UniProtKB/Swiss-Prot annotation, chain B:
Family: Belongs to the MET18/MMS19 family.
Protein name in UniProt: DNA repair/transcription protein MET18/MMS19
The encoding gene: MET18
Superkingdom in the source lineage: Eukaryota
Species: Saccharomyces cerevisiae (strain ATCC 204508 / S288c) (Baker's yeast)
Additional observations: Present with 3150 molecules/cell in log phase SD medium.
Function: Key component of the cytosolic iron-sulfur protein assembly (CIA) machinery that mediates the incorporation of iron-sulfur cluster into apoproteins specifically involved in DNA metabolism and genomic integrity. Acts as an adapter between early-acting CIA components and a subset of cellular target iron-sulfur proteins such as RAD3/XPD and DNA2, thereby playing a key role in nucleotide excision repair (NER) and RNA polymerase II (POL II) transcription.
Region of the whole protein represented: 414 to 620 of 1032
Compartments where found: Nucleus
Length: 203, 207
């Protein structure tokens, strides 16, 4: 099941060779609805199984499978599944592949844009996880840290000032290797993140 | 205030207790590092202190691992009850620290995980020696002689070797005794894993 979970991304990917390309019409039996349909067939059972699972292996499998499915399906096109996805969504924020990282960061972006009760009830949990994402690591690429900055900004904008005032100093302190890392868009955006956090806390 | 493990009854009990702790605080005071053991003269909550301690203990621990709101409210009310000036003995806060550490290493649920982190950090800022003795020393003891091992918290649940390092990074950020003894012990383990073991990433993470 672990191998199947890590290989389960294959079901949902682009082809670049078999779609209803302009010109050709005899290309294949193309159906664009495969992505969404597959998500609607996979997600629900996966999440029910994850909430009905105990150990390292099988829960890691469920997280990896649902993440590798959600990574290729557009996050904004899968809305009804977001609510039950929020637990595994928060789960998928710590694992080696930056692909699932960018995917789950995008999905929290869309969720906090749409959902706010989940964000308000789960901010005390999400914030240090985004902090660890923003920390330099063998798994946190410069782009991954940039995306953690973007999610930090988005969740600070969505969450009311009450919780955001309580989570200003940690972001201001645990970002020093991000506004001084190898790339500079990472540095510029970390400077901007620090400044925006400081101005939101001071006001 | 009746013993109950049901999600609804226990949740309403805890959210009720969340207002009685505030009433007690407003009437009497709050903790200071000098008033860590000094109790207020009289009240009716002292007669009910055993009951609230027991209900909180069974609300956080001796409870199912699927409780996110129950255990979050449990650790929150544990911390808030600690926040009273010397109304809970060092034994009570030691038990609370042990509960937080056990439930944070057993469950990955980032709700209970980060709520226990918040509780442990507040205990650290209000109880230096207590947290350093129960939680920090145990966490430093879970890590083994050799790198890349499964940190066996109990018979089944295990955390990563870097989980101890991450927990050390979490608190001790403003606790003088905790941070100094942690630096000393992490240097000791750096030396040990370099001498009796052959590791690079563990030495890098420790330094």
């Amino acid at each position: 099941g672990s191998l199947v979970s890590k290989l389960f991304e294959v079901f949902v990917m682009d082809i670049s060779s078999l779609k209803k390309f302009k010109g050709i019409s005899w290309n294949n039996n193309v159906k664009i609805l495969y992505k969404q349909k597959f998500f609607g067939d996979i997600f629900q059972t996966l999440v029910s199984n994850y909430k009905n699972t105990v150990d390292m292996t099988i829960k890691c499998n469920y997280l990896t499978a649902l993440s590798l499915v959600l990574k290729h399906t557009p996050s904004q096109s899968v809305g009804p599944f977001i609510n039950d996805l929020f637990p595994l969504l928060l789960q998928a924020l710590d694992m080696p592949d930056p692909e699932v990282r960018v995917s789950a960061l995008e999905t929290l972006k869309d969720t906090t844009d749409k959902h706010h009760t989940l964000i308000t009830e789960h901010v005390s949990t999400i914030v240090p996880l985004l902090l660890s994402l923003s920390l330099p690591h063998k798994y946190n690429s410069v782009s991954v840290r940039l995306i953690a900055l973007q999610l930090l900004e988005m969740i600070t904008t969505v969450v009311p000032l009450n919780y955001c005032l309580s989570y200003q100093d940690d972001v201001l302190s645990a970002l020093i290797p991000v506004l001084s890392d190898k790339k500079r868009i990472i540095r510029k955006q970390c400077v901007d993140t620090r400044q925006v956090y400081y101005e939101l806390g001071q006001i | 205030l009746i013993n109950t493990s049901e999600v609804a009854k226990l949740k309403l009990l805890i959210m009720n207790f969340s207002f009685f702790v505030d009433s007690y605080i407003d009437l009497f005071g709050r903790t200071s590092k000098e008033s860590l053991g000094t109790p207020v003269p009289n009240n009716k909550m002292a007669e009910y202190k055993d009951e609230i301690i027991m209900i909180l203990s069974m609300a956080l621990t001796r409870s199912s691992k699927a409780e996110v709101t129950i255990r979050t409210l449990s650790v929150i009310q544990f911390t808030k009850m600690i926040k009273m000036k010397g109304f809970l003995t060092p034994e009570e806060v030691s038990l609370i620290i042990q509960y937080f550490t056990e439930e944070i290493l057993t469950d990955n649920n980032k709700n209970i995980y980060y709520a226990c982190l918040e509780g442990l950090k507040t205990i650290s800022e209000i109880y230096e020696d207590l947290v350093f003795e129960i939680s920090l020393k145990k966490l430093l003891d879970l890590l083994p002689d050799c790198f890349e091992e499964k940190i066996r918290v109990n018979d089944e649940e295990n955390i990563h070797i870097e989980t101890i390092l991450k927990i050390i990074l979490d608190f001790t950020t403003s606790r003088h005794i905790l941070v100094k003894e942690s630096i000393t012990f992490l240097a000791t383990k750096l030396n040990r894993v370099a001498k009796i073991s052959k590791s690079r990433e563990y030495c890098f993470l420790l330094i």
